[PDB]
Paper text:
SARS-CoV-2 is an enveloped positive-stranded RNA virus that depends on fusion of viral and target cell membranes to enter a host cell. This first key step of infection is catalyzed by the virus-encoded trimeric spike (S) protein, which is also a major surface antigen and thus an important target for development of diagnostics, vaccines, and therapeutics. The RBD can adopt two distinct conformations: “up” for a receptor-accessible state and “down” for a receptor-inaccessible state. We have previously identified two structural elements, the FPPR (fusion peptide proximal region) and the 630 loop, which appear to modulate the S protein stability as well as the RBD conformation and thus the receptor accessibility. In this study, we have characterized the full-length S proteins from the B.1.1.7 and B.1.351 variants and determined their structures by cryo–electron microscopy (cryo-EM), providing a structural basis for understanding the molecular mechanisms of the enhanced infectivity of B.1.1.7 and the immune evasion of B.1.351.
3D classification identified five distinct classes for the B.1.1.7 S trimer—representing one closed prefusion conformation, three one-RBD-up conformations, and one two-RBD-up conformation—and two different classes for the B.1.351 trimer, representing a closed conformation and a one-RBD-up conformation. In the closed conformation of the B.1.1.7 trimer, all three FPPR and three 630 loops are disordered, which otherwise would help clamp down the RBDs. This explains why the B.1.1.7 trimer is more likely than its parental G614 variant to populate the RBD-up conformation, because the FPPRs and 630 loops are structured in the G614 trimer. The A570D (Ala570→Asp) mutation, with a larger side chain, may weaken the packing and destabilize the FPPR. In the B.1.1.7 virus, mutations A570D and S982A lead to an outward shift of the CTD1, thereby relaxing the FPPR and 630 loop, which help retain the RBD in its “down” position in the parental strain. The mutations increase the frequency with which the S trimer samples the RBD-up conformation, allowing B.1.1.7 to better present the receptor binding motif (RBM) to ACE2 on the host cells.
Author numbering:
A (entry chain C): 689 to 728
B (entry chain B): 729 to 827, 854 to 1067
C (entry chain C): 923 to 1162
D (entry chain A): 1116 to 1162
Write the structure that this text describes.
Amino acid sequence: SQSIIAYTMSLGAENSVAYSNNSIAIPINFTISVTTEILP
Amino acid sequence: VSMTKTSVDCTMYICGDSTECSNLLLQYGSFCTQLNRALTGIAVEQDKNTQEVFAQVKQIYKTPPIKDFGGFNFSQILPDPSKPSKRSFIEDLLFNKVTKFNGLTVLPPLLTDEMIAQYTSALLAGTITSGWTFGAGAALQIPFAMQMAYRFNGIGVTQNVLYENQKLIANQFNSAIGKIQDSLSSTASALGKLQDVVNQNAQALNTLVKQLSSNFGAISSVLNDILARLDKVEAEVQIDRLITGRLQSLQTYVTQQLIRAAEIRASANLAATKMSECVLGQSKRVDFCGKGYHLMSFPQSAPHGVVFLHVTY
Amino acid sequence: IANQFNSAIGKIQDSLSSTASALGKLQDVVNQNAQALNTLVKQLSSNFGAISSVLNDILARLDKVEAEVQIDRLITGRLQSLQTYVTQQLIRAAEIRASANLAATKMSECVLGQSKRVDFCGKGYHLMSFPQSAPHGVVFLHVTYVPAQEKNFTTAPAICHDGKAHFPREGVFVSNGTHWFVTQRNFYEPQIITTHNTFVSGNCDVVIGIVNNTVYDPLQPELDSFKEELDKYFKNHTSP
Amino acid sequence: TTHNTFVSGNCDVVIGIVNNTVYDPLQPELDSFKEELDKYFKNHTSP
Ligand SMILES: *[C@@H]1O[C@H](CO)[C@@H](O[C@@H]2O[C@H](CO)[C@@H](O[C@H]3O[C@H](CO)[C@@H](O)[C@H](O)[C@@H]3O)[C@H](O)[C@H]2NC(C)=O)[C@H](O)[C@H]1NC(C)=O
Ligand SMILES: *[C@@H]1O[C@H](CO)[C@@H](O[C@@H]2O[C@H](CO)[C@@H](O[C@H]3O[C@H](CO)[C@@H](O)[C@H](O)[C@@H]3O)[C@H](O)[C@H]2NC(C)=O)[C@H](O)[C@H]1NC(C)=O
Ligand SMILES: *[C@@H]1O[C@H](CO)[C@@H](O[C@@H]2O[C@H](CO)[C@@H](O[C@H]3O[C@H](CO)[C@@H](O)[C@H](O)[C@@H]3O)[C@H](O)[C@H]2NC(C)=O)[C@H](O)[C@H]1NC(C)=O
Ligand SMILES: *[C@@H]1O[C@H](CO[C@@H]2O[C@@H](C)[C@@H](O)[C@@H](O)[C@@H]2O)[C@@H](O[C@@H]2O[C@H](CO)[C@@H](O)[C@H](O)[C@H]2NC(C)=O)[C@H](O)[C@H]1NC(C)=O
Ligand SMILES: *[C@@H]1O[C@H](CO)[C@@H](O[C@@H]2O[C@H](CO)[C@@H](O)[C@H](O)[C@H]2NC(C)=O)[C@H](O)[C@H]1NC(C)=O
Ligand SMILES: *[C@@H]1O[C@H](CO)[C@@H](O[C@@H]2O[C@H](CO)[C@@H](O)[C@H](O)[C@H]2NC(C)=O)[C@H](O)[C@H]1NC(C)=O
Ligand SMILES: *[C@@H]1O[C@H](CO)[C@@H](O)[C@H](O)[C@H]1NC(C)=O
Ligand SMILES: *[C@@H]1O[C@H](CO)[C@@H](O)[C@H](O)[C@H]1NC(C)=O
Ligand SMILES: *[C@@H]1O[C@H](CO)[C@@H](O)[C@H](O)[C@H]1NC(C)=O
């Protein structure tokens, strides 16, 4: 049931921001992330 | 940010349709491949460069339908939906301002200019609605005058200086984005660093094609003329001259293109660094985002490049 | 914070163990130098239009004055095969240099410091980084604060109190829709809007979108708590 | 002092917190005024 598909790529998920002249979002919580960056 | 992905059928360049010439080119071993590998390496690196600059968001933000940015008028740098290509008014000025047998081909970029405009739209709508915060994590909305107040506080100017001058600051900003249209409409010369890259790649290909007309001490530069006029054991000595000069003409082109690709890489790394530190943040690095203390920057797509509109106090 | 950090260092081991692809940028450099040498050695087998590529086969078969012409073909092609290799390796060495200068910059600015440069030390706000050696390279484990659970709030640029307009010293004014608080920009910690969390500038006419709410003053109870004591003193001193 | 420091939460959660006083510069500026206030009430016993 497998095959090779071909498609126009999505640049990402779309996500309209909930903007207003008097609305702010603030984080109630955080995540400490650790990420590997590798360099020659 | 990038240059035209160019691939050459070396065997068509050196020995265009002559099977006997191709049998002679095999006496030089790997050089017919080594140069296709090198040109493919350059060509892949243009898609790499273009993604390191523009793909700094994995999520596509949109501007709200209402335009209450506290009086700041982004209409010239946000998209115009009415066009077939969703490009901003300033991006159309930028797009207007930058203008066979031989085996050469031009490959398309992985991202069309419509996808570069869609990434640039997302970076700009992220910047206008959420400040630096979409750089750090999830986008957090903030009113644009409160973002500008945080900006002012970053340059060491107390945030009451924004709110007590907010109509003036917006009129100065709107006037300055006004002059960006006037500069990008009036002169040809403003886009010089992108036109110079387009010109150098066109000049190197003009040279590469002109060397096909050179004799290198053969009795003719036309390959089929040599093979028409001479029998095989004599013709092989004339053809070895054409193969030798042509192959050296390609190694010269590919060396020049590798050295030039390293310069476009260095520029793409600078452009990606400015996307990160000027658009996704506010920089305390002096003179890194134009003269003045950096407030914020807006990215714009250009043919094979990026324009940053830096805003400074 | 320590459990999130310890958990994240746990995921680094799982990632670097599970896929082969993680060191792709280092393996690609080992592969390029292997491929360029495979090519440089393969060109020893090429004729360059001599009667053989084996140098001793030429010199066994032909006398000096003829062999000079065959050997000159091999010398010419071989020498071009080295100039191709050395040019490719010089251009490559400049790319590895540019990466080493970046890695040295990240050692200085991410490990020996803390970076205010956005996205220079991975996604998030940079906390610190740990270097790890790799064959022909470096791994940096960047540690970053990422804001995780956002909630919306109503907000205002200033509080209007006694016709004086008040602004936050640090952070932003926010409301749950009933009360107003001052809080720090990257972590919800609401506080009463005091004269110590805010600063005055000008009057309330000029600021677009200013809001009416109380500003507290800790001197107010710490001096009314002496008013009623002082009044008790006076009332009691009517008793003699 | 209350000027060199800031308050948040209570002393149960902070690993390795230590017991010491924090000074308040309003405390002498109000209690020098309390001993003054006491003298003014005690002088008002003389009429
Ligand atoms: C906005 O934030 C306000 C401050 O946190 C909050 O007001 C506080 O609400 C709680 C109840 O949810 C009150 O707690 C009192 O509840 C009753 C009062 O009769 C008593 O049984 C309790 O002992 C306790 O005193 C707080 O007193 C109240 N604070 C004030 C200053 O009014 C609002 O409820 C929040 N509003 C929203 C929509 O989130
Ligand atoms: C924020 O609080 C302010 C104080 O309550 C309030 O200002 C008040 O606005 C009214 C309406 O104009 C004024 O009432 C006077 O209106 C005219 C003169 O402008 C007179 O003809 C009337 O008789 C009446 O006196 C108040 O004088 C004015 N008070 C002050 C101190 O400015 C704001 O409107 C409030 N804003 C919001 C959004 O709540
Ligand atoms: C820092 O100073 C604190 C205040 O002096 C002190 O806390 C005190 O600890 C003792 C010992 O537990 C408590 O004494 C009571 O303990 C239980 C009830 O909790 C009873 O069985 C005892 O009979 C006695 O009543 C104090 O009540 C407690 N005080 C407070 C305000 O919490 C800390 O222990 C000190 N820490 C250090 C390291 O110096
Ligand atoms: C914070 O609020 C925004 C939008 O405001 C709300 O809009 C209504 C839905 C109602 O809840 C009002 O009381 C609020 O003022 C939220 O944005 C919505 O997000 C959902 C997905 O979670 C999406 O389907 C909606 O289309 C969005 N609506 C708008 C107008 O943008 C946002 O999610 C809220 N944030 C949190 C963490 O709760
Ligand atoms: C912040 O996020 C963390 C997760 O990273 C939350 O921690 C979890 O909390 C639940 C209870 O709500 C526990 O059952 C889990 O075991 C906790 N996980 C860890 C890793 O500690 C934390 O509760 C959140 N804090 C707030 C205030 O929302
Ligand atoms: C934002 O700026 C644009 C450009 O100046 C404004 O659009 C112009 O508006 C005038 C007056 O209606 C027209 O004559 C121009 O032709 C418009 N130009 C364009 C490109 O549309 C726009 O009105 C401003 N927006 C706001 C909300 O003030
Ligand atoms: C916000 O926008 C609405 C219209 O959408 C307007 O009525 C209101 O006055 C604005 N408020 C502020 C604080 O600018
Ligand atoms: C009133 O003052 C007298 C002495 O002046 C004192 O003994 C008494 O406790 C005081 N009572 C009150 C209620 O202040
Ligand atoms: C520090 O470590 C010692 C043991 O080495 C322990 O007794 C002490 O409680 C620790 N103090 C703090 C503040 O963690």
